[PDB]
Ligand binder design. Structure first.
Ligand SMILES: CCCC[C@H](NC(=O)[C@H](C)c1c(C)[nH]c2ccc(O)cc12)c1ncc(-c2cc3ccccc3nc2OC)[nH]1
Ligand SMILES: [Ca+2]
Ligand SMILES: [Ca+2]
Ligand SMILES: [Zn+2]
Length: 367
């Protein structure tokens, strides 16, 4: 049936700024919120403002030293932390910016709060578009991510769920999450990503977990230009097999929008409908589900994607004609919700897709 949806958002999230020319733009979270408000999707959800996650909540995963550094570093005192910046990988892809720690607190607060709501059986779905920062490591920032809100949310789900399934459709390998749970069978991580001469350089289909975690990490490496057809020939069959074999009791779905056609950093060719089909597929299993954001660097498309995925979560049909909103000019020249794929070549032949799917199916038989 239709499901209850709780949505997490802080009105200040859009004001955090990574710096001039940096592709990560928290403003896209505010564009998403304003678009979904203007479509009237607020009348259908319970809207919550997440608390600022404490350093203590963050150290359930991250090292005390790394969290202490994040809570301390500021653009005005950076000069005194030259040593720690190198140690914790802060200052290149992951710059020091005003309110960095508060931004991490809000991103994490939404994911953890959503997991608590699911644990209490008070919602069917919890949504936190400011979360999904899957690259952060135990004691290091990485790929525009500082605090791994996903790992923290999964640890919260593990208090009441024996097995948790994590699915990541961001164009980049979900390395921080996979690494956190690499040697456990209590979390199965499934990542679909571009692999080959691309960040973070991990996620080979031969990375399948280790020790008790062997066969509990699944990686589907893809080439440039994947389209809705190709993604659609493999996503439902793999997720169906994972659901059958693993039988998770909760699911976390990272909906990174950098896998869409026309992304500033991505090289895939999915439309918003193609990307949202993943949400439709996962939602049909009727399991407690935490939906998170992630990458997405052509911000008009990120807002379209996450607004449509929120409509999918609510089983609410919304028109293609965009309603007027505070960022209406960003959606020109068409002012439509849905996007068209480009003419880029799909390097993922149908035979390649079937062959990788078959290799993963062999690994899934080992559960
Ligand atoms: C989602 C995160 C993607 C990160 C990614 N980083 C990298 O590609 C770097 C070189 C990298 C590193 C450190 N490790 C790697 C391992 C494998 C690999 O193939 C690459 C890397 C990135 N792609 C765009 C940028 C980028 C960063 C900027 C920072 C400040 C200002 C402007 C920037 N512009 C950028 O692209 C307009 N960075
Ligand atoms: Ca991924
Ligand atoms: Ca695992
Ligand atoms: Zn990404």
């Amino acid at each position: 049936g239709k499901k209850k949806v709780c949505y997490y958002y802080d009105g200040d999230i859009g004001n955090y700024y990574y710096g001039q020319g940096h592709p990560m733009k928290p403003h896209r979270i505010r564009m998403t919120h304003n678009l979904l408000l203007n479509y009237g999707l607020y009348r259908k959800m319970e809207i919550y403002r997440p608390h600022k996650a404490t350093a203590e909540e963050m150290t359930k995963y991250h090292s005390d030293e790394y969290i202490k550094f994040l809570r301390s570093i500021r653009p005005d005192n950076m000069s005194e932390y030259s040593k720690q910046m190198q140690r914790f990988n802060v200052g290149e892809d992951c710059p020091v910016f005003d309110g960095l720690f508060e931004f991490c607190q809000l991103s994490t607060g939404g994911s953890v709060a959503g997991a608590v709501k699911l644990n209490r059986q008070q919602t069917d779905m919890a949504v936190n578009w400011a979360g999904g920062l899957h690259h952060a490591k135990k004691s290091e920032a990485s790929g525009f991510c500082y605090v791994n809100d996903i790992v923290l949310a999964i640890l919260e789900l593990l208090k009441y769920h024996q097995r948790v399934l994590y699915i990541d459709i961001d164009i980049h390998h979900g390395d921080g999450v996979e690494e956190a749970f690499y040697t456990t069978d209590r979390v199965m991580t499934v990542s679909f990503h571009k692999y080959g001469e691309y960040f973070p350089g991990t996620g080979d289909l031969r990375d399948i977990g280790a020790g008790k975690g062997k066969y509990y990490a699944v990686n589907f490496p893809m080439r440039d230009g994947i389209d809705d057809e190709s993604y659609g020939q493999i996503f439902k069959p793999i997720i169906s097999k994972v659901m059958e074999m693993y039988q998770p009791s909760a699911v976390v779905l990272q909906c990174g929008a950098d896998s869409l056609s026309g992304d500033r950093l991505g090289c895939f060719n999915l439309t918003v409908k193609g990307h949202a089909k993943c949400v439709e597929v996962v939602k049909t299993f009727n399991l407690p589900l935490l939906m998170l954001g992630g990458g997405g660097y052509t911000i008009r498309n990120v807002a379209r994607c996450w607004t449509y995925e929120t409509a999918v979560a609510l089983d609410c049909e919304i028109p293609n004609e965009l309603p007027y909103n505070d960022y209406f000019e960003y959606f020109g020249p068409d002012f439509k919700l849905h996007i068209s794929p480009s003419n880029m070549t799909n390097q993922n032949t149908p035979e390649y897709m079937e062959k990788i799917k078959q290799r993963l199916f062999e690994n899934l038989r080992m559960l």
